[PDB]
Amino acid sequence: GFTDYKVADITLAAWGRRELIIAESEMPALMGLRRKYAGQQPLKGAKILGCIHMTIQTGVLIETLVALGAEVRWSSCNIFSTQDQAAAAIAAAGIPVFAWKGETEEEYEWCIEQTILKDGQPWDANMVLDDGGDLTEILHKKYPQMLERIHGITEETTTGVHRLLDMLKNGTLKVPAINVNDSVTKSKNDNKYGCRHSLNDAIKRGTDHLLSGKQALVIGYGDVGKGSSQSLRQEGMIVKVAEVDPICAMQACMDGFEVVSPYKNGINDGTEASIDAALLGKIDLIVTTTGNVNVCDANMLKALKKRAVVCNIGHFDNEIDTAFMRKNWAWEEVKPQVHKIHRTGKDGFDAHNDDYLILLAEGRLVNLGNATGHPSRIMDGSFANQVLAQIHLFEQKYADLPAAEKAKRLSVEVLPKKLDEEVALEMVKGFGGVVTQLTPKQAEYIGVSVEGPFKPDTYRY
Amino acid sequence: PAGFTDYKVADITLAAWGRRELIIAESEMPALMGLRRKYAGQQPLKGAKILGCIHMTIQTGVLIETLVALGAEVRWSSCNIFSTQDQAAAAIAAAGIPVFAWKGETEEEYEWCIEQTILKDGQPWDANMVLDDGGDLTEILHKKYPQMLERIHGITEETTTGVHRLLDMLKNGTLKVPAINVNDSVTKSKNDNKYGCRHSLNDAIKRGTDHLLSGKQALVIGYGDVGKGSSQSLRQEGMIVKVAEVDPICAMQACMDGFEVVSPYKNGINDGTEASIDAALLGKIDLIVTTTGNVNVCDANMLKALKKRAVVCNIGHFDNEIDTAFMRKNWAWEEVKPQVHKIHRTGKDGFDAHNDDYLILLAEGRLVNLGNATGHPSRIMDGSFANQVLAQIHLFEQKYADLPAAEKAKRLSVEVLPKKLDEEVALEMVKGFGGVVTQLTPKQAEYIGVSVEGPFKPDTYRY
């Protein structure tokens, strides 16, 4: 008689379970943590509020936390990223989950609230797992008393880490956090190679457009921009890259990309005259990867080549000025998460109009919105880190400290390199890779232990 | 030429050719020439006396003349016996700059050349700055001329191996002057160490052997910055590349980058026995490249097990990555041409000229890109050497040797340049490609919590 959930269709659970069983075989680091810690139950007594894309991969994360002793209440961190069969399998296992693909904004907020409240009252949560900081922000702003019981937050992604660091700087962060993003087995695995796999995947599923031979503009060249540019270049696109960071721009040049700005002299003065119209008029596909606001702006959208594809793979949809397109242009749905935006006006459209753009997932995370996000074998790294971060903070019991001790303990830290290397070794073995063991003389020669860590903390890989 | 005799180079008559190539290189090095124009008037290195030890290439020539143009006097040697470009050395000597370097030095001559920079007219020069690549000059100063370090304000160290040696001295309390780790600027490590080897590894293998690489099997030992660039140098030519690593994080990157990760040893266990060698794997390898900065990562038993006619080379800083001593002791060497030897595994005394059981060793195991070609191209070295100039300016202006003891104790460290300067070097490199960097709006800068002028990333950022 379990009813503490809300999903699109519970009858998808058997399908979800079949895909979970396959996904476990693709996630050796995560499944390895089940075997290594199950006897010790390190999360016994943990009550975790979780807010992250309710995919099949997240299902294996959830059931790992539960297998190690935790109770959880779960929601997705995006309105389009849930896989309904994954949400169904989790609910059918008796786990509170509130998530479906295609939520409204109101339903999204309601879903997070259903994790926070149990039977109309605040749940006795003591841990937080977040992707983007939305759950973290709601707790700090609307339920601050609950944070007096919480031992820590483990944050998945670059945008959420920024929000944590803002609070730490302002002295408004109430509990310590682990920056899971900046494990190398996360940032340089998930953010880069994950988007390499899943960006062209989502574009093909949404449009079935040939990419070879066509012109792309990628805004940003951090980890997501690097992986996105490679996703397109390996398909044969001619990829140009925009950046505000000269070091990242240098990498794009050395990686074989032309570095350009949407704006003359790179100066974004807000006018149509600033736009390089010759450049924008040649672009078949624009992808935003920045975590910044309005990097594909109204004047760029006006200048784009007819029938260009526009999408965003950064965390939030304000990278693209979709508000401008809602106010001024008519949207024609092709199929779910694919809209033609007719630049002829707002008052309806000609079905045979040639002057439109194609927007994917309404500007939301395109790899999760139009496909299934990163593959299991990549998310294995990210989620093995999440499990270790949950154990790490839960075992330190910050919430039980007096205030003076809490102040000394309050931090936003990454996991130690030894754990990063432990995750990596399990990933490598999953590929059948064989790591070489240093001899004693060799370890002494380069100044490391045979067991690692093999690099100083300054190392960038 | 003229009364100036304070140099030793292979052939001073190569100077005009060297000057022609320097003028071309200047056009390829906008960050370095940007610093030359920016600081020429202020002469920030006026009074600096720099001992320099780094590959005497055309690129180093532009570095040397930038330091001199900013006011420094220098005395120079190469940090490798095979890396000098003789026309570069000739052009520098012809400019009146003391340089002791030629391609193909003996080990004794290599040491002599470093000492000729340290000594002027039989007595220590009044040096007050050090620029080093690998730590050889740093070590000679600390061991044999410790009194000279009393007047030296800092060391600017180019490469990973040299930085490791500096950090060991700092931990032991034996480092006498502060240093800047030039290697770990992003416009150095993630430009020079990676993309430089991408350009110059397959370059050197082609010049030495003219072997087709496409379709052949390679084993790259290591997947740090040099191993990453080296693996790409070979894969982009169509080699089937396998990668060995001891670091599981670097091994993970190799897998995701599309390489098979293997070990020369069964189950990765290097117990010193021949039985531990994966002979089936090594018997398929046409090319092995060492990239580690470690010792004996291509060992005797690996060399015995390699496929006949395999090429063996090293692109790490020191030749002890390969057990060439084993090969000198046991096998007959046949020089094909300079820096290319066939190593006949049939025995030590003489060889059959038509023997099929040989390996081809490049540069006698020394840095192959510089030994068999010309190292990294000017436009890549632009980044490394702009950082060197900025590092020399910073430490010279700090004047460590003149500070009170309490201030010395606070500044005796190994530091990197601030990220703002890394970004400023990068911006000039991007402009050199014709790239255009976008300026954040005030609102966008506020949104991500940076200044419009940068820095754009926290110091934790790995790029």
Added chain:
Amino acid sequence: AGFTDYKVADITLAAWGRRELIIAESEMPALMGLRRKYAGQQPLKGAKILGCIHMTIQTGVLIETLVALGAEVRWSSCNIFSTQDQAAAAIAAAGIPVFAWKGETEEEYEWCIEQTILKDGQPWDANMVLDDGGDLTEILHKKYPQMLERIHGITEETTTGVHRLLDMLKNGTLKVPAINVNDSVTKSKNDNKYGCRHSLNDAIKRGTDHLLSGKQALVIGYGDVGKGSSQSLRQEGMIVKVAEVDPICAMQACMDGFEVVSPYKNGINDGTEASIDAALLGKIDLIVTTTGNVNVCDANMLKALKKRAVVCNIGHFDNEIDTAFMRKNWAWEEVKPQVHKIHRTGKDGFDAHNDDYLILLAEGRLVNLGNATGHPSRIMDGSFANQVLAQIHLFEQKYADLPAAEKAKRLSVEVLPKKLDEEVALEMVKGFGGVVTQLTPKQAEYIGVSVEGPFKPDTYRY
């Protein structure tokens, strides 16, 4: 008004299909240029075309181009899994007879072809054939030979179908001439190669969502499909090994940077388990067949494959993989449509948590069309512009109206002239925004060509 001469999965998908056709038209400039160039001339007026080819959105644009040029058609798919149901619905809603849906049974597949051949229970007065793989051509020759007396020609899309035509020609059983559409360069070296480059990894991702980077693939074949397939996987970071029986194609694989291996020790396939390179196959995470041949992923290979390997076929017919052996001996667990786990533990049921299974895509049928949407519109533009030109040419030649003595002189399998191949290519290049340079008169004389082409001798291989 009362149109019932069709059978599709769901007619209410038509509006969706029409939205996708309107998009595809903007992606197919060569085909739409033919529609615009020839519509007023109506060169296919009087043509009655039996068509058998994957009922995709791309085929919809082809169908409506033929109709726009004056043809009547009756259509079926050439594979049980390749139809896009919204494309079929849009074509039926346009009043065009189409019999096609995704997930046909073999009996339904044959019934659909027969529904194009028969109209109101009697042979339609067809006079042209468009085919992809030769199934319709075979049924006509075997079961409706009297209909071929009135047919002017066959335009055949794919390598396997052309092989079947040439077999009939050498045996003296081919009844009407054909155009080999496959061997236009804007077909074979566009569709067969780059199309599979686009759609192979596409279909694997949609079926399994497996990471491909870092994993080991074996591609059987290195012809045009094998070349494009190998690139589809290598560009994702797979470690790709290639098998071939043709030493020239094997040479290309080596030079392209692949290791060339055989499933069999020393390449010798003696039919025993002992001849299988068990060490090699035990490392393979994905095997793809691309040959047009029979049993190139055989029962002993399937027994030796690494646990949880993915098995798929992108050649025309499913007999490249011995799926019959898997049906007879192993238990099939459906993951979702066109994705099956095949449990090698036995035939009578399976442990839901068994680790010893293979993942088979599309039941061994063409995987790019079965698990995704096949080639993209802008690639199919080239193939289908060639189809329209081939239909025009054979229809205008009117073979069926010739005396028997003249039929014998005209009975052949031919390709389109290079000048038309070039004209298709030029529209494709313009579609990318590319600008082709024009020779000066002196340059044209220097290399011995006309300024307008053709630019290459017929021997040229590109």
Added chain:
Amino acid sequence: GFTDYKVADITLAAWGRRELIIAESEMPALMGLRRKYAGQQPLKGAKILGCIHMTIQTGVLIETLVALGAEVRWSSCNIFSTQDQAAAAIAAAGIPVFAWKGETEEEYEWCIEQTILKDGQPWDANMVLDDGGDLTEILHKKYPQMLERIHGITEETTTGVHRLLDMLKNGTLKVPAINVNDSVTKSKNDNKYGCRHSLNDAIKRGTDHLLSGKQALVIGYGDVGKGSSQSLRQEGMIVKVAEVDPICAMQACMDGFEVVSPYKNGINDGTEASIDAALLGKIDLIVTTTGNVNVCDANMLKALKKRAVVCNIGHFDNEIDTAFMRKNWAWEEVKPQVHKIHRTGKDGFDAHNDDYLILLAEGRLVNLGNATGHPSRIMDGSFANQVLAQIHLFEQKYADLPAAEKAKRLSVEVLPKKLDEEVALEMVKGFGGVVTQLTPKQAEYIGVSVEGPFKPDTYRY
């Protein structure tokens, strides 16, 4: 006391021989033919005039022909392509060779005539091996009586095949020829992959320029243009391709290149107004690959970005208008086969002038002029075909046949596919590749012999 030769330096012979011994291990198809036919001596009595780049690879071909029974007299087919240590080794073996790197044009003709003449009179030659048609043309125009005794020509390269087909079309070809170029193990091996290996090799040796991140324009996308474009793209260049053949241009697009013209709308009207000056002003490297005339013309050279590199990898230097540059601009030699061309004027230059182009090999074949051309394991395919072609035409004995039988055989032909396959099989085994053998049922199913040929003659690979 052998003195029937002319080389730069005979003392380089020991070095040349060391490199020949290495090269033999890289050339299994050619050395397999040497071992296979040694007993038969199929070229006994053959007297071959040879004209092809005097490289180490050509040295292995020469000694294979001699090992099969031929006498030869040899010259290079380009003034810059000889490797002097290869020529010296061949001369020190007692084989007449007239070739050095850096011949003048007058010396080039002298070397060919030295092969044609022995002791001041025409040699009793009966076979021709040519690369580009220069020797073929001299024989037809200056020594026509010698062709009465010659059984055939085996021609290496696309440009020479074109010249043979023009002669045949005009009725002026006096002896039959084999088009060696169009074996698949030549055209789609040598012409493509050879240039992939050796184009960026030569640019690096000449200039040591970084290529990654810079802009290249490749003129042509036939086999040489395909291989050249890959040579630059794999280094990270942003490569644009020009073509007059829309089918080749289509391939360029699908292969991920932008297709552009030096001329506005592709129309070359001979004036500066027709040049796309914006495009050419951004180009760092131009490579001509066409076999055509004046495809990098004077107006393009005027418009190129300052300090652009200019080079040609087609057979003849007239692809670039070097005559215009000799007439109008000042040439500064950097080093052999590397010249700065100062666009400031004819009489002298400023040593610090910034307005120059860098020309490689004076517009001659750049891979052979500034490096060593294709590697041994690629030339293995081409030169195995050469040996088979020489055997076939010499055994046919055209010069001995009565006139009507000559008329049946006066043609330009290719080698049979079976032989193409057998060459390829030896190349594959050289990589350690394992070709699978068809079962009898499989061979019947696709309609081939288990032994091949495996493809119809129409097949394009």
